[PDB]
């Protein structure tokens, strides 16, 4: 019967003291998290809990402590907003895609049936069986235990129908086509490509 009064009083007192002290600590952390958040990437994670961060200013700093996030929920390559000057990680950032990458996605879905391609029946069959057939089947390809090839290189003289076949494949597939060009992935800034 003593445990009622003694324990309830003590535990509620510790609850309230710890609660307002947690609110104080959280307020201090929030006010200390200066918003600018210089964006940086974790190039590697190493044990002492410590990280090597390459900032968007093209310079890499070692961090004696991780910061305000958890080291377990991190890996190489993640986007983290570090402090402008302290360079300490303040929060993790969701996967960010450049405007060029988003524009790279096919949204108009050009309409080109395979009937518009003449003289390439074997080539169309190879492309559809290497790029589309392993896509919407998958599990049965594993059932036969046969490895579907990872990539296809369409090569030949100009005007043979390479880009035409690619456009037709984008037309007659439900996959999210991601078109691009070689010169697109060439930029002034180091590491931009």
């Amino acid at each position: 019967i003593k445990i009622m009064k003694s324990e309830v009083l003590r535990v509620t007192h510790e609850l309230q003291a710890m609660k307002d002290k947690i609110k104080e600590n959280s307020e201090k952390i929030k006010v200390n998290k200066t918003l600018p958040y210089l964006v940086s990437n974790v190039i590697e994670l190493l044990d002492v809990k410590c990280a090597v961060i390459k900032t968007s200013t093209r310079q890499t700093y070692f961090l004696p402590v991780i910061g305000l996030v958890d080291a377990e929920k991190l890996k190489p390559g993640d986007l983290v907003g570090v402090n402008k000057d302290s360079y300490l990680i303040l929060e993790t950032l969701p996967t960010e895609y450049d405007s060029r990458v988003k524009a790279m996605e096919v949204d108009e879905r050009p309409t080109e049936q395979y009937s518009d391609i003449g003289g390439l029946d074997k080539q169309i069959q190879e492309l559809v069986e290497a790029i589309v057939l392993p896509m919407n089947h998958k599990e049965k390809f594993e059932n036969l235990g046969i490895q579907p090839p990872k990539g296809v290189l369409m090569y030949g003289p100009p005007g043979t129908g390479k880009t035409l076949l690619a456009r037709a494949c984008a037309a007659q597939t439900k996959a999210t086509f991601l078109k691009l060009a070689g010169p697109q992935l060439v930029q002034m800034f180091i590491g931009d490509g």
């Binding site: 710890m18 700093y61 070692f62 004696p64």
Partner: peptide
């Protein structure tokens, strides 16, 4: 609370050039 104090102590740490 201990994790909060640990991150508050971690706040004073500054990066080191590589």
């Amino acid at each position: 609370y201990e994790k909060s104090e640990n991150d508050l102590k971690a706040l004073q740490s500054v990066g080191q050039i590589v």
